[PDB]
Ligand binder design. Structure first.
Ligand SMILES: Nc1nc2c(ncn2[C@@H]2O[C@H](COP(=O)(O)OP(=O)(O)O)[C@@H](O)[C@H]2O)c(=O)[nH]1
Lengths: 316, 39
């Protein structure tokens, strides 16, 4: 038979990483030829990341640790354009290296809850010595962490346990109402993604509820829609790795001020789970399949999707 | 209606950090510099 999966959820949650993971697990993965393609975007994301932190030092009034870094910042803007989509000079490598190692830039990086910094930022900057080398070809894990501009709908085909899978991702691209319907029609199961580590993000001037509650209010709509009654709702509470680290210093009471439990990862993780699951108005007709994932962790995603497939099997 | 979904869907799905996806363009590096020239 044929199985249609629709990925949903907030921007920067896991959706496009999951689709890439399906290619790594249930398809050939990424060829060395296809890896060369990404060398360009790797460097692009690296520079975009460091820029974003520098920029945020403005909003957060965080000065440079070492006075001299201001000139390195300036060099970055001059040399950046010359990162001509497949070449990072040792000149430029050192510039970024010095900035990322700066006491002040770090101080700002640690406050990434006060702005919006991509979660692939720390992955690249810590690996510069490897990325900067002239004969570098992006590893399987490197291609996984690359951030490309979303276009219309992304799709992937794979066969797993004698099933023809078609997985759809629409997010980011503000799509037409009539192109949304084409994605809902005949959907077997929805995989809704939630970024657990989004719990401590600090409110912007436009929003009227924290990000977790926005991802909630969306779920409350997907889950209880007339279109999805005979549809399996799978919930990936993603970014559990970051969430575990975050919960060590920033209490879940930042996000749910009414939360009376301890600031252990396990209790808080389970509490968030309850919050999304409780939005299901139909318990007599429907149940939500929840998994705590780490989308960048191929092994973990493999396990989880395996468990997801078994659900789909006995529900056809 | 099933319309109140579509509005909130492509708002929430278009959230998150930007100027962080795709290839690094000169217009992007310029706006980065322009900002830097104040703090
Ligand atoms: N550390 C960590 N990073 C993650 C995890 N899941 C996703 N990310 C990263 O954070 C971003 C998530 O957004 P992405 O899946 O790429 O696009 P989306 O469709 O908007 O969610 C990507 O840059 C991922 O590399 C996770 O579980 N742990």
């Amino acid at each position: 038979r044929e199985v249609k999966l629709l990925l949903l959820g907030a921007g920067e949650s896991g959706k496009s990483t999951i689709v890439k993971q399906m290619k790594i697990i249930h398809e050939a993965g990424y060829s060395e030829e296809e890896c060369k393609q990404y060398k360009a975007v790797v460097y692009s994301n690296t520079i975009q990341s460091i820029i974003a932190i520098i920029r945020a030092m403005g909003r957060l009034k965080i000065d440079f640790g070492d006075s001299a870094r201001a000139d390195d910042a300036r060099q970055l803007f001059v040399l950046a354009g010359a990162a001509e989509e497949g070449f990072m000079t040792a000149e430029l490598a050192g510039v970024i290296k010095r900035l990322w190692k700066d006491s002040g830039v770090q101080a700002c990086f640690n406050r990434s809850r006060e702005y919006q910094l991509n979660d692939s930022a720390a992955y690249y900057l810590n690996d510069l010595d490897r990325i900067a080398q002239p004969n570098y070809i992006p590893t399987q894990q490197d291609v996984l962490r690359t951030r490309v501009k979303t276009t219309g709908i992304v799709e992937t085909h794979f066969t797993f346990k004698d099933l023809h899978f078609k997985m759809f991702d629409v997010g980011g691209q503000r799509s037409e109402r009539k192109k949304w319907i084409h994605c809902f029609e005949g959907v077997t199961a929805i995989i809704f993604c939630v970024a657990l580590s989004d719990y401590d993000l600090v409110l912007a001037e436009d929003e009227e509820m924290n990000r977790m509650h926005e991802s909630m209010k969306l779920f409350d709509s997907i889950c209880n829609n007339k279109w999805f009654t005979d549809t399996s709702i799978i919930l990936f509470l993603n970014k559990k790795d970051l969430f575990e680290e975050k919960i060590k210093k920033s209490p879940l009471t930042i996000c749910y001020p009414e939360y009376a439990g301890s600031n252990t990862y396990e209790e808080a993780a389970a509490y968030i789970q309850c919050q999304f699951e409780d939005l299901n108005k139909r318990k007599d007709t429907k149940e939500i399949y929840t998994h705590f994932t780490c989308a960048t962790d191929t092994k973990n995603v493999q396990f989880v999707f395996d468990a997801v497939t078994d659900v789909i099997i006995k529900n056809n | 209606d099933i319309e109140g979904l579509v509005e909130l869907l492509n708002r929430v799905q278009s959230s998150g950090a930007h100027d962080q996806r795709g290839l690094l363009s000169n217009e992007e590096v310029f706006r980065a510099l322009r900002d830097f020239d104040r703090w």
